[PDB]
Design a protein around this ligand. Sequence first.
Ligand code: CLA
Ligand code: CLA
Ligand code: CLA
Ligand code: CLA
Ligand code: CLA
Ligand code: CLA
Ligand code: CLA
Ligand code: CLA
Ligand SMILES: CC1=C(/C=C/C(C)=C/C=C/C(C)=C/C=C/C=C(C)/C=C/C=C(C)/C=C/C2=C(C)CCCC2(C)C)C(C)(C)CCC1
Ligand SMILES: CC1=C(/C=C/C(C)=C/C=C/C(C)=C/C=C/C=C(C)/C=C/C=C(C)/C=C/C2=C(C)CCCC2(C)C)C(C)(C)CCC1
Ligand SMILES: CCCCCCCCCCCCCCCCCC(=O)O
Lengths: 37, 33, 136, 65, 505, 505, 58, 57
Amino acid sequence: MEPNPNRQPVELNRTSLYLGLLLILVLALLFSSYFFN
Amino acid sequence: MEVNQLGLIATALFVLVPSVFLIILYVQTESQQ
Amino acid sequence: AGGERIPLLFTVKNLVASTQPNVTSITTSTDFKGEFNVPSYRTANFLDPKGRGLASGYDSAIALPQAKEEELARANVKRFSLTKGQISLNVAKVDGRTGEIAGTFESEQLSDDDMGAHEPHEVKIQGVFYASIEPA
Amino acid sequence: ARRTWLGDILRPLNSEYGKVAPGWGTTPLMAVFMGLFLVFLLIILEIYNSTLILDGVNVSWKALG
Amino acid sequence: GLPWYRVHTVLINDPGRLIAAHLMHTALVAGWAGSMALYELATFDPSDPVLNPMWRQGMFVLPFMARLGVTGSWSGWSITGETGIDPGFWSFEGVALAHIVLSGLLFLAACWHWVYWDLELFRDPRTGEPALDLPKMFGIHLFLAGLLCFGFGAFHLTGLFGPGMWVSDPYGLTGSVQPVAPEWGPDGFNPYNPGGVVAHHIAAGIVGIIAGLFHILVRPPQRLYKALRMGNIETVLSSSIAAVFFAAFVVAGTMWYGSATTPIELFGPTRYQWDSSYFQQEINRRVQASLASGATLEEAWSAIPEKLAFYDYIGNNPAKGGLFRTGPMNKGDGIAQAWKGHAVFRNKEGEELFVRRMPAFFESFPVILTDKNGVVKADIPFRRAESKYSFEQQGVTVSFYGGELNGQTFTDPPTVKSYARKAIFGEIFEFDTETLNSDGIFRTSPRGWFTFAHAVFALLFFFGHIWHGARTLFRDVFSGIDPELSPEQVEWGFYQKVGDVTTRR
Amino acid sequence: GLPWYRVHTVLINDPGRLIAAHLMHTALVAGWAGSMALYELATFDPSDPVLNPMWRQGMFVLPFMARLGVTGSWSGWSITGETGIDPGFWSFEGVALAHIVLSGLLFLAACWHWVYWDLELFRDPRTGEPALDLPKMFGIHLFLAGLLCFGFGAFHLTGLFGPGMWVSDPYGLTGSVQPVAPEWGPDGFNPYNPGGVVAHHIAAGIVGIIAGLFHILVRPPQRLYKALRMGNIETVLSSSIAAVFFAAFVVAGTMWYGSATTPIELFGPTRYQWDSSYFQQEINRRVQASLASGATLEEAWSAIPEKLAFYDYIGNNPAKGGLFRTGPMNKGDGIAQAWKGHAVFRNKEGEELFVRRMPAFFESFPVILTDKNGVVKADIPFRRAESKYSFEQQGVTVSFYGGELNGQTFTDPPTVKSYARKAIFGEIFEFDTETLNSDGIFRTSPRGWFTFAHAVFALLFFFGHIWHGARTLFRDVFSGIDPELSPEQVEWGFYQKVGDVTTRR
Amino acid sequence: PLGISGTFNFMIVFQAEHNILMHPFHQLGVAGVFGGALFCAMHGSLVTSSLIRETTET
Amino acid sequence: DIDGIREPVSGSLLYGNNIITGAVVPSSNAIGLHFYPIWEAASLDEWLYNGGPYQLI
Ligand code: CLA
Ligand code: CLA
Ligand code: CLA
Ligand code: CLA
Ligand code: CLA
Ligand code: CLA
Ligand code: CLA
Ligand code: CLA
Ligand SMILES: CC1=C(/C=C/C(C)=C/C=C/C(C)=C/C=C/C=C(C)/C=C/C=C(C)/C=C/C2=C(C)CCCC2(C)C)C(C)(C)CCC1
Ligand SMILES: CC1=C(/C=C/C(C)=C/C=C/C(C)=C/C=C/C=C(C)/C=C/C=C(C)/C=C/C2=C(C)CCCC2(C)C)C(C)(C)CCC1
Ligand SMILES: CCCCCCCCCCCCCCCCCC(=O)O
């Protein structure tokens, strides 16, 4: 049985890394006050 | 202050889990090219 | 239900049980009612899991050297209860030949209080009894 | 592809990919059932809303007796 | 490579790994169910279903097991308070265990389908390409849905072969699992009639069988096949999401308004029962009745079951919570211990006075005592200097009938005010705040939490519907519009009919 | 590629990025010291240098600032108890700020050297290869180390231009920062003579300056250059680790045993002061003197300072802790509030009895009272059935002198028994257990934690020395032995000298 | 017992009732496992030490 | 003391504020529109109580 032809590489460029890390850290900054309550 | 004690673990995982996810994806992108 | 285990010293120690007055014979309507002592479920040498006891053992919580003792006094100070129970014996079968009787019983007593550590429960016990009477 | 016993049994159930009835087919009949179902949801909604009030239908907890 | 937000599209043309993924999802959801129940069993206190029911304890899945007949524990308790029962294997624990075993079995099947993805069943016999005859699959699955739906109603809910479901009186005092017979009349559409739930599943089950049979034998019209791209699995995702968010809005509403399937002994009262004084009406009804037949005040109120009094108290109103006030309601006002009794206030002239009750909108509310006509006769003033109506000036006293303070009267103004500040919440209870280290602030119930999550998820799945619907109908331009789109096609007047090149002028 | 445990070897032939790596490590460390100090200020209670000194509060870096002359905060308190004091910039807060700023400048330096790694300075003019002249660098760095060592002793420690260092009396009552003269005599080598610390730095600094000069001017002989592989930077790593773990064992030693650099007012008592009853002896001397001058028992014991009694208590013995008993000592026995007084026990015959003290080995210890001869006279028995020495049988009383209980006598056996159980710990103190929610179990002091960490670290660094020492001397075969190694070199009898082919037959 | 602390309990009670430490079969067991650990490290170290160069340093 | 009424408002994290509630608090009403640099205060202690940093920032 052949290997699966539907597989694909996945990518995240550096700029998307910086964008996503900013998103997560600012979201944590906003909700943390509410988690500690 | 008398804050909810699980707030710390909530906040730590809230940061760590999705950040690690992004870092995993970025580094394996770089070792491709 | 829920998983709570209730130990008890099921006992008739020092039983004194009496019939109604003017009993010319024991019949299948004869009732005895009496009371017994219920000593502590553990006796004085029993050591608890941290080595504390009444007649032996540590007299304090040695694992917490500088804790305030006042919070622990009820656990540190073992106490020996003695309480009373009540029992009914209802004769429902008599072999007037042999002097054998048989019937049911109900008793009420208290359960283990763990040498004063917690409050006992009320227990009601039911069952059957047999006795043989001999001229003394 | 790999054949299996269960595969061969189920086979005809996944064998008519693409088959259509011609033209509009049962579309008019579907439209009727859609219409009936709209009216029926309307009633159900307006009963819950107390905009449709019906005899012996008391929309309150007191309909548990 | 693929962007991160598209990793799962590798399954679009791979029915076997699509099944593998769906199995893993189903494994995870069932696993959750089993984990959630175990955590709840380990934290649930079954010892008082009157003043510490499951819905005060932050219980979420326990009420859904109870709703359909699972009411006891292997440990010997039942949620109805009966003790020494033997549930058999279908205890809370056994239900939890089955979902975990099911989870493990789904996990293994997922592995098998992921490795052996290339099954001939998934190939179109004419072209050798993977293909799923989605119209016929719909008919098969719909036929199955209808069998299950019908059986659920015909056997489980009736008690014919099954336990029935939770039913209760209108005041949630005596609920239990009973078989329910169908209501075939128009009151079967009454959301508060449990017989309608039975009839629905029977009739709808039969319609589903018939519709299923139709959709297995009758092919889709070509017009419709073309319109809805019935060769594209994503059209099914688009319509499926739409049905899912429809269902989600419905279950949120019936949870919030109440219906036969959201009984208050499993989920708590609704806010509307506070708005309309639903339990307070009933309580007064009984005191009047006790009085008419000559009982004393102490007697009339002592006859009031605590369970009913506890519903007439705003701390159980699901609209008194907050988003980040977490945990069980007990964590806020405490673990209710006893009804203190019904507080009656009187001024120095013997007139009875009535505390104005807090409306759900208000975090805080002033203490205002009115007479039976609604005229203000006492309050607790803010500015003291021009106070007309103070408890001190008006001689207000509080007397208790029934409950733990029955037959007690208080006259010292600070004590009387203290009870008047609680009377705005409805009936007055004694709470244990030490055990949970309760902070004193009202939390919402499971009815509230469930409604919030499901209303929110619904709205979000509407966006999913719009996104995947768009993707289906505009598949051809996903990656961009035609680089040879000619300007005559988008400029006005060239074609009579917009976009149709055969209508040139 | 590279194994995970070798990633950092990319720096071996890259002096610029090595410097960058080292700058970054340096920034991390200064950053830590500033962070650590701020956390300790945010949590330090300065209000009681007697019964709540720093070493009771888990302060770790606070004493190293105190040790060298930083003693005050910008908020106007000092650790010597003096209020209303202007420390200038070099307060605890200013020192922390400085390390944070320094950390940030080193961070930027590291980015610069990382980016501009290819500097011509790091390349050998002869061959154009990256080269570091390590003999010359050593001389340079030794000379600088000597200058700093000398100046630190000549100016900071003497007070010529600088504050001096923590000095105290032999019982840790009156410590403070004072200039210290050098002790040039043989007592300079006495670890308890502070003047030796000064003299050490002056002379050692001078020696370093000369040695550094020799090492800048005189090339190493070919013999040693080959034997020690001085063209290979890993040789420096190997010898450096060795000097490091050597140094780490010494500071662990001097911290455990005590020295002029590890004062008890900053780090707590040593265990050996408990073992020899060092403080108990002195307290007794003072008492025996007062009674000589004709004061009463109350008067003689009331003259003992709280500070001195607090040292005669096993809760401050650093050898009484546990590895996972975490936090400050106040978290164990609580926050010391007052001396209760010296407890004197007597039997019914009026003879005075002495509680035998707990040795540090013992987690728990029986209560045994002996007379002045050490004959057992009273105890708390385990088995009571055949006790002869119970307090009830012997009429044991307790009377207090000094402290909060001065002049009180307790006669009921339960009370006498609780004070006898505390008398095994030494002097009895009133503690606050509520504030920190203390659990009653002894912790160790910063003296113990410092000693543990450095002795562990020293031992591991030994393995680092062996590792990099072997990699230096065996670099040629680090990847494996020579694939064409003849048996004649490794088998017996061929060569007259092992591993020398010239000695064949 | 099937536990970590229960194992130690079993070990301690054993020593008290049998002086297992003074029993030569246990002494042979300690030689067995000490020596087995020794020869384990010895063999590993000796083979590792004489690996033929087949790779580079990276 | 933002409002000059000797009623200090706590604004910083270490004095019991979180991210949402924290603030650098405006300078005292007793100062009005007067310039209040550091060197116009008897001490940093005074400057801090009266809202000095708001003006600087
Ligand atoms: C004798 C036959 C019989 C009987 C007695 C019933 C009885 C019942 N049916 Mg069933 N039914 C039957 C046959 C029968 N059915 C058949 C043959 C079918 C066809 C297969 C169905 C299909 C069916 C459906 C699809 C539904 C019912 C529902 C119900 C219940 C109505 C009460 C209720 O709470 O509605 C409450 C529900 C409504 C009032 C519908 C509201 C519709 C919303 C408002 C539409 C708009 C949503 C929109 C996307 C949101 C927009 C934004 C919004 C936030 C503002 C009741 C148990 C309803 C139900 O399950 O309720 C839980 C329901 O939704 N029935
Ligand atoms: C439908 C889902 C659902 C519902 C309604 C409940 C409801 C409840 N649970 Mg349950 N639970 C669930 C799922 C659910 N649970 C799941 C999936 C888990 C596993 C994690 C649990 C685990 C669990 C435990 C362990 C406990 C509960 C408990 C409770 C009770 C209190 C809940 C609470 O305080 O929430 C408060 C909730 C919040 C404050 C959540 C807010 C959501 C955040 C802010 C959203 C983040 C925003 C996001 C980043 C958006 C930005 C995106 C944008 C940038 C693009 C209540 C009955 C508790 C209880 O009382 O049990 C006895 C309890 O201890 N639950
Ligand atoms: C049954 C529901 C369902 C299913 C099967 C899919 C399936 C798909 N979506 Mg759709 N979608 C849905 C609901 C659904 N969606 C809903 C409700 C929304 C609105 C929120 C969307 C919005 C949406 C967008 C905007 C896009 C898709 C895309 C896709 C495709 C790629 C997804 C992917 O790789 O994600 C990868 C995602 C991750 C790796 C991580 C996401 C993590 C999120 C932020 C939080 C985690 C949630 C948590 C783990 C568990 C869920 C909790 C609760 C829902 C139960 C795939 C066919 C993509 C597409 O079209 O590509 C062609 C795309 O761009 N979806
Ligand atoms: C008049 C001049 C003068 C004076 C008064 C001093 C005074 C002092 N010197 Mg300095 N010294 C001087 C000149 C002077 N020095 C000069 C000119 C040099 C040459 C540059 C040095 C080099 C020097 C060194 C290298 C050391 C001192 C140390 C000391 C202190 C000794 C007291 C002590 O605590 O030792 C305690 C130290 C020891 C007793 C030596 C430890 C030896 C151990 C046993 C080595 C073996 C450890 C081994 C690796 C592992 C252990 C195995 C196992 C137990 C774990 C004291 C402050 C010592 C010090 O600073 O200690 C704090 C020290 O280590 N001196
Ligand atoms: C720039 C100057 C400077 C100054 C004045 C200070 C000052 C201080 N630091 Mg900071 N520090 C600095 C740079 C500086 N630091 C840098 C660059 C770093 C990062 C590496 C740190 C990291 C740091 C930490 C991690 C800590 C301090 C601490 C302290 C305080 C106590 C210092 C102490 O006990 O040293 C004691 C130092 C020694 C005992 C070193 C002795 C040298 C040994 C013996 C090596 C000898 C080998 C030598 C080559 C051979 C010489 C031969 C001889 C013949 C000449 C003090 C306020 C402590 C504190 O309280 O912080 C809050 C603390 O814990 N500092
Ligand atoms: C911190 C002080 C220090 C250090 C690190 C060095 C380092 C060095 N010296 Mg310099 N030197 C110094 C001070 C120092 N020197 C001083 C004060 C003088 C007097 C002016 C000199 C005079 C001098 C000369 C004259 C020469 C050097 C040389 C050298 C180099 C080679 C050393 C060698 O072959 O060691 C060999 C030693 C070893 C390989 C390892 C020894 C390990 C010991 C023995 C272990 C002991 C363990 C034991 C258990 C612990 C003790 C127990 C306790 C009871 C005592 C090296 C760079 C040589 C060189 O190349 O010059 C350029 C050289 O020719 N030095
Ligand atoms: C030289 C190192 C050192 C030392 C001696 C101290 C000492 C102290 N600290 Mg400081 N601390 C340090 C470094 C150090 N700290 C660092 C680097 C940080 C930053 C994280 C801190 C942060 C810090 C805080 C935040 C606090 C302290 C506090 C304290 C005090 C109590 C510590 C305690 O309860 O320990 C508990 C220690 C342990 C439980 C030891 C854990 C070791 C385990 C066994 C891990 C190792 C296992 C390993 C994975 C095995 C794998 C092997 C593998 C190869 C097979 C004490 C005076 C406390 C205090 O009182 O503050 C005022 C406090 O609150 N410290
Ligand atoms: C001054 C100290 C020092 C320095 C500069 C080095 C430098 C180096 N070591 Mg040596 N080493 C040291 C101390 C040191 N070591 C000590 C003390 C030990 C004994 C434990 C060793 C044992 C050792 C071995 C066994 C090996 C090296 C190797 C190496 C090289 C590669 C390191 C690497 O890629 O790690 C990469 C490491 C990681 C990605 C993560 C490691 C995580 C560790 C286990 C825990 C993290 C600790 C944490 C950050 C806090 C540190 C606290 C600190 C105070 C101790 C590099 C030249 C390797 C080599 O020879 O390459 C050819 C190798 O095989 N080292
Ligand atoms: C294999 C096997 C087995 C086993 C199994 C198991 C053991 C299972 C488990 C399972 C489980 C145990 C599972 C669980 C799961 C869980 C989950 C899946 C969860 C989820 C979650 C989430 C998703 C969440 C989310 C969130 C958050 C976090 C926040 C808030 C909001 C929300 C809700 C969104 C058996 C033996 C049976 C059999 C054989 C085989
Ligand atoms: C840039 C800049 C700046 C800034 C800076 C900063 C802000 C920094 C900071 C920094 C810091 C803030 C740092 C920190 C660090 C820390 C550390 C480095 C830590 C460490 C840790 C560790 C390593 C640990 C370990 C361990 C554990 C965890 C457990 C137990 C055991 C042990 C101890 C081992 C400034 C403005 C100034 C200037 C300009 C520029
Ligand atoms: C600010 C009020 C007090 C006066 C400050 C005195 C002047 C600054 C002293 C700073 C002490 C650091 C000197 C030791 C640093 C050694 C030199 C170095 O290695 O970089």
